[PDB]
Design a protein around this nucleic acid. Structure first.
Ligand SMILES: [K+]
Ligand SMILES: [K+]
Ligand SMILES: [K+]
Ligand SMILES: [K+]
Ligand SMILES: [K+]
Ligand SMILES: [Mg+2]
Ligand SMILES: [Mg+2]
Ligand SMILES: [Mg+2]
Ligand SMILES: [Mg+2]
Ligand SMILES: [Mg+2]
Ligand SMILES: [Mg+2]
Ligand SMILES: [Mg+2]
Lengths: 213, 293, 159, 170
RNA sequence: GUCUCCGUAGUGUAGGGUAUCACGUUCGCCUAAUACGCGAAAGGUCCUCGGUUCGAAACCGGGCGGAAACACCA
RNA sequence: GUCUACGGCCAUACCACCCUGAACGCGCCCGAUCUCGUCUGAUCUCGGAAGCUAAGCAGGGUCGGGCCUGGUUAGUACUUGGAUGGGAGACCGCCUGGGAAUACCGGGUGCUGUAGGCUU
RNA sequence: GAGCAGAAGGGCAAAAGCUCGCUUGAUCUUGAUUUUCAGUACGAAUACAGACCGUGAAAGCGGGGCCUCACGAUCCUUCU
RNA sequence: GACCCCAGAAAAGGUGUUGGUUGAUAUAGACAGCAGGACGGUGGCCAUGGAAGUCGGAAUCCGCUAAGGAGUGUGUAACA
RNA sequence: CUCAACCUAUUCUCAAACUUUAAAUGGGUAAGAAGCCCGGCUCGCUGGCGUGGAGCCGGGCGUGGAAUGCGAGUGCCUAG
RNA sequence: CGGGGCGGACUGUCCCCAGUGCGCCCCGGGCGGGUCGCGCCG
């Protein structure tokens, strides 16, 4: 009973989040945003590939769910189930509305036409900008061709134009890959979970001496 | 750690400190606004107020008016200059509060040149007195009492300072409800036990009271009264002579003192280079201690 | 369709600035407002008495009447195609002296004194302020350094 | 070695008795505090209505008194004598102040009266150093400062030294 | 689609200060036995969530179900 | 060089912990006859001057948090006006002017008015 | 991060919140002004001025409710 | 195919052609063609009814080596 | 030993009815002779004061106190 | 890019171990702006 995605492709309205004013919103189709070995440390998956949108548009929660599954199946096939970690980086926080008309042979039955036309919550979409990252995959450095192909397949589930980009950052961190190792060597970066903690050279020295001890 | 830290980073980022003198617990800005602010249609006419502050060991009486750059004090009187005439012991009491309030009144009137007019109530009686301006003469000085944070119950020493000033010649609006002679149940001002408080007879009775029950307790309480022999029977005459001496010479002279060196007693603020050197040394010492193992 | 409430749409305008709530500073009460001086109408929200209406916030007028707590201000309001001088009573919390008139009075005092000094010593000096003139000719020295050659950088994709 | 202004001492003893409901029980409990303290007790109303406890809001539920000075010290020794000068370490608090409870008021001092009940009572002594009053003061009030604060360990020494008390591991 | 009403012992129902009645269930009597009859006992988030209140089955906002009344003129 | 009383601006002043404090001062402190308030002289009010700077307070310290102010972010984001510019559109580029904010990296950590003291 | 009667927003800490004490400025009057606006009215509101008071030691504050809503012409009737 | 508004088109494709980016191989002879080799443990283990390299689950090694994957596909019930 | 809750330092993504910070465009006022500076007089308002404020009366100051452009002010009647 | 002599203050190298700043004077090198500045060249 869902409308074609072309009806809600463009960011035509102001953001309409689920809040105390917008009640009765059905849950989004996508509930999981990280897959693969999420517990892998930062050094395990140095290579990171992104899907980047070229279009300012809206992506439905169903499309994000479809592309997440499509990329997951191929990575599991090509890199094993523990050889990657995917992060969907768009959350469907914008609610789209439908002004539902009775699909019967009669406007006499209180179709009401365009009177009181403000619609009811019908779904949730994610608003994406040009240059924004839709999906991210981190894995080992020999799986680059599998990351590109997996992201290429997931592009077919999306309305507009998307670009595949191999980032120069190390994994999911915000630090460059070529400066990553020596920054850990000089303890500017400390690993935790799947990310790193930047340690600035300020604050109490007591935290400086727990490092170097 | 099992409970959210209330004073986290976000708590200090949104924290709005109060006014400095509000944080110090010295100024009630709710009362100050109603005391210092002049009507806009009176323009730069000063609004005077009698500041009375009773300290553990001193009484401070000041007359000031507000200006944007800060309060301007036109005359001040202290209870520590009371020993210049008569009363040298038993300061910061009700009798000394009357004396310093009277001294402030006489000193201010002397500076303005209005001593002969507005003598005030020379003969000390506790009854209500209010000075009236004399026609053809400059008007009586009008000011208002600034009690501060003191609890203004009946018998407060700030009203003793007010009584001394109004008897000195200053026109301060007031009532007798807060004088020691006021009776709560009968709603009657005795005006005679108030005069006894002004003359320190309550203290004088206490000295002769303690003499008859416990001698050493009397010596503990009135130890400095024993020095120079201030006895209960001479207290009223001591205060009368003090009042008369205040009337005769209220002018204040200051002790000169310039034969002082620049001795600095506070540690100066450390420079940026010293702070970094200290961090560098502490870093080096920690590493060096590690190589000892 | 919009309501006609006196404070509709004043959610942010009459709100206090960040970390500046609480007691009103008392220098704002000690300011002296004569007749004929120029004041800006702010309209702080801590004091609800004598508040200006929302159409006078950010407007500047001339004081014509002084009372115990407020002033009478003649301030221009534009209603459709007519500008008419409204007279409003505003408590001194919501107004402050306009520095546009203060700076010009300083300039007049400089101008009148500068004219006096010029007559006393003799020669002529410029009083009017001129618009920023075109730049005069000048020499720019290389100092034995060749100016650095700039080049547009190649494009590569940020993130 | 220690400054005399750092000596620990009893600020107040804060006796409290809580009964279920307002009535003759509360009034007789008030007399129990009055005889022990020689001091008029004050009743405390219930903040909220709780059906489980059968209390209604603004209803007098408990009677309490605060005792200071030598009177407090004499009441404390009677109560400690009931507990045989044995306090559990959990009873001492992080703020530096401890409390104990007595099941029967009759045993210490007061003879049982047929009119008077069998009520027990609650002790909570507050320990302080000189200068703790600066927080209570109206003018120029201030916090006491870290070194001047009393720790749970310091209170435990004070009991162990003043009353030859025993702090059982409980 | 619009508007209105109702959710309370197992059943059918009454009713802002500790929940009623009948039937039903359990136990004991009478009877050779069952039924009837007699003497006792037990049974109820008052549909759900939030709010007002000292206190909500109650009062108000919602959400789940059920029952109604409308949808005409070409 | 400091303090007290009253302040102005109201964190460069706040918060946490540590160190130091000579002299006046401010305090802590002692007491409850009187004044006045308490369930309690704890607070408030009053009368004092044995003791103490432990605390308040002042100064200093912390690769301190915060705050203030710079750099970067960045001529980036956004934007006035223009085109018979591009593109199916979504949007984007250019011309003409204006031009931010995080993260990240530095510096600073109360100034001052009136009156009155101490400091050889 | 509570509360301030209620919708929401603003405002507020020795406050504007809570508890006590005393009270009736929720009183008698004339004008001016703001809001809607035609710059008409009503309603509501602001600053004054003249009385008579309340409270507080006093400065002051108060002519209803912290502010933004809570209301009604001619004719007729009724009361003072 | 052919000119603002404007009067019709998208995703997705092309070994048509043109330009560009990045990477790789090559006289120690690339690329494409034609012509030889493409083995032993080992019909490797666990799945079995046959699964021998090719229906599947894991491992991915050794020697001859110039080179052979304990296997890319066709095929066989399995072989071949 | 593990999974929860909780706390701490991080991390992804958001707001028409959120916000520390915060543009561009925009709104008000000022850019003098009704101004400035000297004296003096009046007041029942204000008042420690020859105070404060306002008004009034004389006198002297023109380099006419940004650019650009333009002749302005004012009344009655009035259609659509 | 720094040299000499006196007061504080810091470091877990404390045998006169090591290091930092400030207050006065004596020097050393470089840079910018005014200078009747003074000469030479265009
Ligand atoms: K609207
Ligand atoms: K509306
Ligand atoms: K009106
Ligand atoms: K009055
Ligand atoms: K009538
Ligand atoms: Mg269809
Ligand atoms: Mg829309
Ligand atoms: Mg007060
Ligand atoms: Mg009001
Ligand atoms: Mg810092
Ligand atoms: Mg531009
Ligand atoms: Mg009046």
């Amino acid at each position: 009973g869902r409308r074609p995605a072309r009806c809600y492709r463009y960011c035509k309205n102001k953001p309409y989040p689920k809040s105390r004013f917008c009640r009765g919103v059905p849950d989004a189709k996508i509930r999981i945003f990280d897959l693969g070995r999420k517990k892998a440390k930062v050094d395990e998956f140095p290579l990171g590939g992104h899907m980047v949108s070229d279009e300012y548009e809206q992506l439905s929660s169903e499309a994000l769910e479809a592309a997440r599954i499509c990329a997951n199946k191929y990575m599991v096939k090509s890199c094993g189930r523990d050889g990657f970690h995917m992060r969907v980086r768009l959350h469907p926080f914008h609610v789209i509305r439908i002004n539902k008309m009775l699909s019967c042979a009669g406007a006499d039955r209180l179709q009401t036409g365009m009177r009181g036309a403000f619609g009811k919550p019908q779904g949730t979409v994610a608003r994406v900008h040009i240059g924004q990252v839709i999906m991210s995959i981190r894995t080992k450095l020999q799986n680059e061709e599998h990351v590109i192909e997996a992201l290429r397949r997931a592009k077919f589930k999306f309305p507009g134009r998307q670009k595949i980009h191999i980032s120069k950052k190390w994994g999911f961190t915000k630090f460059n890959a070529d400066e990553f190792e020596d920054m850990v060597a000089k303890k500017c970066l400390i690993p935790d979970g799947c990310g790193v903690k930047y340690v600035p050279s300020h604050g109490p020295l007591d935290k400086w001496r727990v490092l170097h001890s | 750690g099992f409970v959210k830290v209330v004073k986290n980073k976000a708590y200090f980022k949104r924290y709005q400190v109060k006014f400095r003198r509000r944080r110090e617990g010295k100024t009630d800005y709710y009362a100050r606004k109603r005391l210092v602010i002049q009507d806009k249609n009176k323009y730069n006419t000063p609004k005077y107020r009698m500041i009375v502050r009773v300290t553990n060991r001193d009484i401070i009486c000041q007359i000031a008016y507000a200006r944007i750059e800060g309060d301007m004090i036109v005359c001040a009187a202290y209870a520590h200059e009371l020993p210049k005439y008569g009363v040298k012991v038993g300061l910061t009491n009700y009798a000394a509060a009357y004396c310093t309030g009277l001294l402030l009144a006489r000193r201010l009137l002397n500076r303005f040149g209005m001593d002969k007019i507005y003598e005030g109530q020379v003969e000390v009686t506790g009854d209500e007195y209010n000075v009236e301006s004399i026609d053809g003469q400059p008007g009586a000085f009008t000011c208002y009492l600034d009690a501060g944070l003191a609890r203004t119950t009946t018998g407060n020493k700030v009203f003793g300072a007010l009584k001394g000033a109004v008897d000195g010649g200053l026109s301060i609006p007031h009532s007798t409800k807060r004088f020691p002679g006021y009776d709560s149940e009968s709603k009657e001002f005795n005006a005679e036990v108030h005069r006894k408080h002004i003359m320190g007879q309550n203290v004088a009775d206490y000295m002769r009271y303690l003499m008859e029950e416990d001698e050493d307790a009397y010596k503990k309480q009135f130890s400095q009264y024993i020095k120079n022999s201030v006895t209960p029977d001479m207290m009223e005459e001591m205060y009368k002579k003090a009042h008369a001496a205040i009337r005769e010479n209220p002018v204040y002279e200051k002790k000169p003192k310039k034969e002082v060196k620049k001795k600095r007693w506070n540690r100066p603020k450390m420079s940026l280079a010293q702070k970094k050197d200290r961090v560098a040394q502490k870093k080096a010492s920690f590493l060096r201690a590690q190589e000892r193992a | 369709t919009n309501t006609k409430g006196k404070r509709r749409g004043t959610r942010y305008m009459f709100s206090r600035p960040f970390r500046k709530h609480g007691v009103v500073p008392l220098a704002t009460y000690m300011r002296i407002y004569k007749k004929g001086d120029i004041v800006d109408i702010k309209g702080m929200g801590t004091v609800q008495k004598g508040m200006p209406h929302k159409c006078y916030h950010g407007k500047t007028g001339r004081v014509y009447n002084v009372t115990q707590h407020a002033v009478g201000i003649v301030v221009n309001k534009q209603v459709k195609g007519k500008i008419l001088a409204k007279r409003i009573n505003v408590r001194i919390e919501h107004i402050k002296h306009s520095k546009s008139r203060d700076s010009f009075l300083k300039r007049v005092k400089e101008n009148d004194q500068k004219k006096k000094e010029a007559k006393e010593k003799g020669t002529w000096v410029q009083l009017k302020r001129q618009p920023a003139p075109p730049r005069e000719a000048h020499f720019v020295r290389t100092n034995g350094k060749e100016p650095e050659l700039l080049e547009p950088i190649p494009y590569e994709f940020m993130a | 070695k220690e400054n005399p202004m750092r000596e620990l001492r009893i600020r107040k003893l804060c006796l409290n008795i809580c009964v279920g409901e307002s009535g003759d029980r509360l009034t007789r409990a008030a007399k129990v505090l009055e005889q022990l303290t020689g001091q008029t007790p004050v009743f405390s109303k219930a903040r909220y209505t709780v059906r489980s406890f059968g209390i209604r809001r603004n209803e007098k539920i408990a009677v309490h008194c605060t005792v200071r000075g030598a009177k407090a010290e004499e009441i404390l020794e009677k109560g400690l004598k009931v507990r045989e000068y044995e306090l559990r370490k959990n009873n001492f608090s992080d703020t530096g102040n401890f409390g104990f409870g007595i099941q029967e008021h009759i045993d210490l001092g007061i003879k049982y009266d047929p009119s008077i009940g069998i009520y027990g009572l609650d002790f909570y002594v507050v320990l302080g150093r000189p200068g703790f009053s600066i927080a209570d003061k109206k003018r120029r009030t201030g916090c006491i400062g870290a070194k001047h604060r009393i720790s749970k360990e310091e209170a435990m020494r004070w009991f162990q030294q003043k009353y030859d008390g025993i702090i059982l591991p409980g």
